[PDB]
Design a protein around this ligand. Sequence first.
Ligand SMILES: NC(=O)c1ccc[n+]([C@@H]2O[C@H](COP(=O)(O)O)[C@@H](O)[C@H]2O)c1
Ligand SMILES: NC(=O)c1ccc[n+]([C@@H]2O[C@H](COP(=O)(O)O)[C@@H](O)[C@H]2O)c1
Ligand SMILES: NC(=O)c1ccc[n+]([C@@H]2O[C@H](COP(=O)(O)O)[C@@H](O)[C@H]2O)c1
Ligand SMILES: NC(=O)c1ccc[n+]([C@@H]2O[C@H](COP(=O)(O)O)[C@@H](O)[C@H]2O)c1
Lengths: 212, 212, 213, 213
Amino acid sequence: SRIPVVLLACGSFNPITNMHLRMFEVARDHLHQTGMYQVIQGIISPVNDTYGKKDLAASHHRVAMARLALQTSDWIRVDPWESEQAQWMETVKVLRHHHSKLLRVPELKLLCGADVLKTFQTPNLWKDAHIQEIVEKFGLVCVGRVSHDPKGYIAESPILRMHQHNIHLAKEPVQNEISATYIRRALGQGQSVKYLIPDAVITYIKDHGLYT
Amino acid sequence: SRIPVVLLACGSFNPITNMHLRMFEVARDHLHQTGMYQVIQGIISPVNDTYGKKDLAASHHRVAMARLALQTSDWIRVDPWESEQAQWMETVKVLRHHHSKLLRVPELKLLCGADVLKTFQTPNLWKDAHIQEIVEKFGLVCVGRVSHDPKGYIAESPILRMHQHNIHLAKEPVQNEISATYIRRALGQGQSVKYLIPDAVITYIKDHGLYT
Amino acid sequence: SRIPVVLLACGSFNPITNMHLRMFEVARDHLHQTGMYQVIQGIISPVNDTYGKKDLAASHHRVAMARLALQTSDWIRVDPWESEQAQWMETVKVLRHHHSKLLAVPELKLLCGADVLKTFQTPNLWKDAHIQEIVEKFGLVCVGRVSHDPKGYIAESPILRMHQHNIHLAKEPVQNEISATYIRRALGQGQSVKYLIPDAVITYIKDHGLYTK
Amino acid sequence: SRIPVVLLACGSFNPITNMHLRMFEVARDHLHQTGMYQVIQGIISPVNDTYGKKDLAASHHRVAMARLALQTSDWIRVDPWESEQAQWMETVKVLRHHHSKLLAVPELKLLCGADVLKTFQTPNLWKDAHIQEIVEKFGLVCVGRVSHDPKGYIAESPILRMHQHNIHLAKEPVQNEISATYIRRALGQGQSVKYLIPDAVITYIKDHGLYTK
Ligand SMILES: NC(=O)c1ccc[n+]([C@@H]2O[C@H](COP(=O)(O)O)[C@@H](O)[C@H]2O)c1
Ligand SMILES: NC(=O)c1ccc[n+]([C@@H]2O[C@H](COP(=O)(O)O)[C@@H](O)[C@H]2O)c1
Ligand SMILES: NC(=O)c1ccc[n+]([C@@H]2O[C@H](COP(=O)(O)O)[C@@H](O)[C@H]2O)c1
Ligand SMILES: NC(=O)c1ccc[n+]([C@@H]2O[C@H](COP(=O)(O)O)[C@@H](O)[C@H]2O)c1
């Protein structure tokens, strides 16, 4: 039988966009395609407000937009836990938390774009022990992104190359490179972002005067 | 004051996708950005079933999906006229028809991707007289597409370069290259196309067993 | 053992670019990776000056630029036969010509971008009989292009689908999407196209004053 | 008249690619087009071997490959000073070094991809003081990269926004998106990278057996 899988996406979702959503669909089809897994749930987990040097919309807003974006999904949901904690938390700790919840078994895997594998290379950004735990205790499902060569990132990482069994590379045949940075800039200039992010999210943004 | 403009998109819409929809939004912002026009209406006109060597879903279905896709739009509508004619019609004739309807004045402009300008170069595909009428009597609003250099197409076309005043090039800052061919193949393989085309269109496709 | 293969690319080469050259390399690696072919030669065949609606530099120059571009290739050569004819010739006839020239005979395959498969769908552009002969008697090696879905083009064409075993799809992960149209526009404006097309080609264009506004 | 400008690119160049070289050309044309600058030189400065978590070919080799790649450039040269130091050096210090070497003094600007602007946002990666000095005292010329929105990076950074006049954004319409990571993987698998990186660089890699699995 198939191994039940839950996919967790940790990010800013400032705001959530059609690309972020498409990432889950592609990842699920890829896992199902292997014949060994049954994706049963997707979880969007917006980062806490204390994170970064950037000016993120308040977490309750990012969580609300994600929920709106996901109303039409029958398998992906937003979980505010991470954003409700007092402070930012390294991603492995969010994985640990959700793994436990599953117990109160399906495998919990981190879902990210190929761009994330490249960030693993950034000095001091991710503790080696954490990278190892992500691919050894949990799993990593990576969706392609223009300009990134995931197979090379893996081959060149002493840690990743030793845990390839837990790394799933899903190819994105579609050229959908929507940048949330671009979304925010366009919104700020009064330009349309319709068809780039969900309609309900656009309405929410207008209603709450976000990204002005 | 601003010149009222109506944008007409002639295509297969087999099925209509988020890229096709995004094309209108980008074109409108670009025209408004110039300061000289006020886009008042967008029209999607699905091609007639007698067109091509391809197997297109029946026109009533393509028209229905476009209408569903456009329910959330307050300015773009589908007009079945072209698809309801007995036979295929060169595009200039569809422009003429809609121009007349406007009379029962706003300028009517053809909306297309940069890829269309390249098709103007195909031997025997578009009558020179027709290309001329499109850019001289009406107008052409072109939205960028990867791999295409619209400025070069114009510069190299004896006809286009003489009517640059009626050609508006709108740059697509977003990497959204969704191919309807890809959409059909994925649907045929049972893969998700969610977030690539409107939810209501996906439901319609399933309900009517299209693209199997 | 392996089936010997010669790759033929028919196109404007106005001018030849690093992307046109890259296609040969990607196609060769792909065929070798299947383990059943051995590519022994590549042929660049510039189209006749009588062809199409667009303006082309003289074939004399396009053949020259291809020759210069290929000086550092040990397996690809330019063949001016097609452009030396009195008039344009349908691609199937160029394939036939080069096949006869080969006459244990290596297989001759047409090398093209995935966008060519789409053009097969254009009314009146290619004779069905020709499309069939091209895929059946010669074969196609298609290199992917942003925005095109070759697999779908194949599936939606009865002719291509029936002979899909003779259509080899290669994937070049690198964007490239360098269009010769862009190259010509840049040149006309006095901008650099270095590292987009071969240094030797730029020298020829400059020396002979080509592609000026 | 025009302000003389020298462009400095700091990076791995592991190995240098046609895309890295193309960035210099695109950046020069952009600055010239503003009508107020005249680019007089480009400098490729390979990073020190002590840098980062990834494995780099020896700087001896990266400097060599850059020199070979640049033999056909009449304005870009490789400068090994940075890689010859005992240890890695923050980019601002390399800029300071090259500025002193210039000492009517031409302006020295850091040439980079738009993705570098994003990295400025990484906690602990660049000192705010350094980011400020880089944009204020030297300047940045950023060449666009698929997936990145430089204008947004600038607007969302107080430091960059305040000195945005010293950040020059150039647009290369051509995809390219050739990553050195891909180049290294292809080489390791014995695939061709011809027309993606300079012929002279491929010869050196082959002669010295670099980038093997
Ligand atoms: N060391 C870590 O655990 C680590 C480092 C960088 C980013 N992250 C997470 O991945 C996402 C990165 O977001 P940005 O790329 O916008 O900074 C966030 O969810 C962030 O919390 C975790
Ligand atoms: N000569 C003409 O008027 C002409 C030629 C080719 C396509 N078209 C139109 O433009 C669109 C092209 O569709 P395809 O590219 O799928 O063939 C259709 O609406 C078609 O009717 C018009
Ligand atoms: N029916 C045919 O044989 C046929 C049709 C269209 C293009 N072609 C060839 O394709 C190549 C490129 O043509 P384009 O520049 O029109 O895309 C040329 O060699 C041209 O001769 C052949
Ligand atoms: N704080 C700094 O000066 C700083 C930080 C990160 C990268 N860099 C430089 O950027 C270039 C490329 O670095 P990456 O390979 O890490 O992207 C190198 O020259 C590196 O030294 C400088």
